[PDB]
Amino acid sequence: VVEVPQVTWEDIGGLEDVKRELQELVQYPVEHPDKFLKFGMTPSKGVLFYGPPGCGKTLLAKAIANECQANFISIKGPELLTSEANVREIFDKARQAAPCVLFFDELDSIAKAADRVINQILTEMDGMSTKKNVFIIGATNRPDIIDPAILRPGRLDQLIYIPLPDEKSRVAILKANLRKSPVAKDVDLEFLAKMTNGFSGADLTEICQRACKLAIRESIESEIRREREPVPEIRRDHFEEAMRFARRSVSDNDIRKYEMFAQTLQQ
Ligand SMILES: Nc1ncnc2c1ncn2[C@@H]1O[C@H](COP(=O)(O)OP(=O)(O)O)[C@@H](O)[C@H]1O
Ligand SMILES: O=C(CN1CCCC1)Nc1ccc(F)cc1
Numbered sequence: 001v002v003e004v005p006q007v008t009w010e011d012i013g014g015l016e017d018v019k020r021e022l023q024e025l026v027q028y029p030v031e032h033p034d035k036f037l038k039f040g041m042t043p044s045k046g047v048l049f050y051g052p053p054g055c056g057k058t059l060l061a062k063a064i065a066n067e068c069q070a071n072f073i074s075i076k077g078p079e080l081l082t083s084e085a086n087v088r089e090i091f092d093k094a095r096q097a098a099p100c101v102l103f104f105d106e107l108d109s110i111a112k113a114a115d116r117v118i119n120q121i122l123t124e125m126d127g128m129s130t131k132k133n134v135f136i137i138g139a140t141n142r143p144d145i146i147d148p149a150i151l152r153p154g155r156l157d158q159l160i161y162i163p164l165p166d167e168k169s170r171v172a173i174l175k176a177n178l179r180k181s182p183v184a185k186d187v188d189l190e191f192l193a194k195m196t197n198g199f200s201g202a203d204l205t206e207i208c209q210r211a212c213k214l215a216i217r218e219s220i221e222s223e224i225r226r227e228r229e230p231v232p233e234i235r236r237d238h239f240e241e242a243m244r245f246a247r248r249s250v251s252d253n254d255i256r257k258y259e260m261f262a263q264t265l266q267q
């Protein structure tokens, strides 16, 4: 399906510099048109996100579409395998759905036939002006095998690191998830953040989902019992039980590999 996503910048904890950079990348062409005309600036054709799984790459792509009130089309890397015309088709449909964000997920899979699924993607990108109002986003968990051809001027304009959340970002992720939830006053999310070093955004969200269901299931059984004979909160003891089912999904060794890649870039 194609639609304007409902996720916003507010649903995304941490990454405040990245969000700043992205909002400008898409707000300046429409907020400062005369300056873009005066100096010969062209809008960006897209960006490439890299980092460990479950830390916000997909969320940021949907939030860019929501900011621009644009349709969102998601394409999974391994699904381009059945046929070089499939890269042709998907760009046609993005063009038809403009203004549109076209998101290529799981691109590390293509980087390992597949050699000109790539060549067709690079072809479709060069033959699409920015006046077509399609914004391309790719994401990968394997930055070491990126073909630098995709980052040349005229294709994806910047490579952006989305890291595991630090302690402050873990508090923000928890708060954004629970933004519209009835959390008990005995709940200390800053202590929860301190006990989840190494957790991804997805790992933290699973704790929140488990704790919400425990409170709902408890509410069901309490009312069943009272009928023999006031919104209920998610309490500290629901989070205590939910943390029993929790552990990181990204190993210490992969984390070292991401940090080396980004530090050597001076990024
Ligand atoms: N920065 C974040 N803020 C809030 N929730 C997050 C964040 N990162 C991940 N999540 C949670 O984990 C899920 C998966 O994140 P996603 O962006 O799909 O990861 P990926 O980086 O692999 O694209 C999100 O739907 C959300 O529930
Ligand atoms: O992440 C892996 C390997 N993982 C193991 C389980 C799934 C894939 N390698 C890697 C990570 C970051 C980097 F910059 C270079 C290489």
Ligand SMILES: O=C(CN1CCCC1)Nc1ccc(F)cc1
Pocket (backbone or CB within 6 Å): 144, 257, 258, 260, 261, 262, 264, 265
């Ligand atoms: O870190 C680098 C260096 N490059 C320099 C310019 C950009 C980064 N490579 C690398 C990192 C992890 C890994 F698993 C394999 C290779």
Ligand code: NA
Pocket (backbone or CB within 6 Å): 051, 052, 053, 054, 057, 140, 141
């Ligand atoms: Na990922």
